[PDB]
Design a protein around this ligand. Sequence first.
Ligand SMILES: CC(=O)N[C@H]1[C@H]([C@H](O)[C@H](O)CO)OC(C(=O)O)=C[C@@H]1O
Length: 624
Amino acid sequence: LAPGSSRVELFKRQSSKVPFEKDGKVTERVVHSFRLPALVNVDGVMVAIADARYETSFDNSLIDTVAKYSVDDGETWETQIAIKNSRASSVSRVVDPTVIVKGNKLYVLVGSYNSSRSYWTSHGDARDWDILLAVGEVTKSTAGGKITASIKWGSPVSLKEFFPAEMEGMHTNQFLGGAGVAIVASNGNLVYPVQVTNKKKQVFSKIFYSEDEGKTWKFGKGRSAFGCSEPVALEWEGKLIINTRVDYRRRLVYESSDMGNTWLEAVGTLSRVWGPSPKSNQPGSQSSFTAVTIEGMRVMLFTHPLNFKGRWLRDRLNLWLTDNQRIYNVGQVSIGDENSAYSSVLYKDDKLYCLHEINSNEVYSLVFARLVGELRIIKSVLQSWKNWDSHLSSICTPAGCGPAVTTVGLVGFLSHSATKTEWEDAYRCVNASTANAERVPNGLKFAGVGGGALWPVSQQGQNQRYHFANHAFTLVASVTIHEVPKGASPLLGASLDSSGGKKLLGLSYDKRHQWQPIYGSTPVTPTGSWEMGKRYHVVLTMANKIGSVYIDGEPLEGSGQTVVPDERTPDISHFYVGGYKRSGMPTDSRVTVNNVLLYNRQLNAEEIRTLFLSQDLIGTEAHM
Ligand SMILES: CC(=O)N[C@H]1[C@H]([C@H](O)[C@H](O)CO)OC(C(=O)O)=C[C@@H]1O
């Protein structure tokens, strides 16, 4: 982790002690491993909840739920056991503690097991399982001229009575919380995203919520796909966003406007973006996923390990920042190549913290980190986002003023800034690589075999921030052709393969001064007319499997065709700009490209016409 940042080993493996209560007797007991961090703020007191695995890190062993709390931002802590297991056997355990804060109360939901030695999803029945809720009340005193906190943990109550034997077809077996930190919805509901099994041993996610302060609970009727576990959720613009774990696959993300009655995959923003390993073929993880306000902008924070080592090692814990449009990698929170899987991020009084695991030889500690550097970076990126959105929106468009340039769904913008080999994203998330490029105001001039710029889509590798483009996009640019080509040459497009030979949608230009719009695999029909040196406005749109190509605000003749067979979903390799950037491709595009914009939707007619009219006003050169 970053410059200026620091940590301590707070929950220390084989060292920290907790008050182990059995049969009315308490003994300070050393704990082998601590896992499943949840870090929250209750009325100014920081509270950290986790598993205390007494003798071993094996999942199916002796576990109580431990809590530490601090009134001085983590400088000093008191320690308690928030929830004890049944003591029925040497493997009795309360597990996957999931926390909600409302007023001065901490709602903690745990699974409770008595004697099984096997993993929960493997169970053929529910005989060893219960689902419990404990409430902790947090009070503060200023006696003695100091702040003293205390937390009184009530007895756990079983919520089993609220679990229906049947759901939309299936028969239910067990459920648990998704671990970490859940929420109170804007309407006051307590909301836990939960992981549920059926008699087929399939796992799936749902919304489990209470409209009466936790006295009664209900299930939404919809669900995730099968295979989605450990769900984590936040509320964004009136809707729940449910971020799920999928072992051996990319993470799936869903939105619901009705407490889980209906679930829609968020294909246009966050779903399938985050991979659980470099090859997305290893176990997933628990993730922190919260909505916060920083310097007045509403955003989301998300953590997940990169897992270069594989299996459940889960090294290299990374933190991400997004506004539901752009997706920025803040960086690695953990240190070196240490194993570091589960985590919890907290933003309190304009300070950022992380409670996370470190794992050596299957012995786990939780470190408590002060993310000083990470918050500095975050605030710089958010400033950049605000500044450019402000710039675009402040432009008085050719009428007094016409309609504003749209920033809604604007994800990336290539304009004046660039280096010898990169065209820089003004929004700072994804740069394009270049070859044979010369800098010019608000863009690049390209020439020669192998020339052009490449804006990676699936090529981003593990984490694919532009996976929305396989469902809808609008890509815009101003282009100027300097030489008549020998035969069709490319200007702009979306490629389905690494070379650019198989295109989803694109535009090329030919020796007869015609345009060559390319609609999927359809045979190309040249059309319209172009002139050398003239600056043209180009827009490619794709939505609902149909692509269109506009020139100067006007649809090329024949635009509006099918570019995706309704069976399949595309896997776009990259966008190419100003050529293919492939030496293996024989084309030589001699062109200047300025002001490339990528939106995560199909722009409408008015929007398209406004961008056309304000071409010469949107560049970044004059304002840095
Ligand atoms: C009850 C239980 O076994 N929980 C385990 C959990 C589980 O797999 C998931 O919460 C449900 O599918 O996974 C992990 C894990 O480090 O990957 C830690 C927990 O020990």
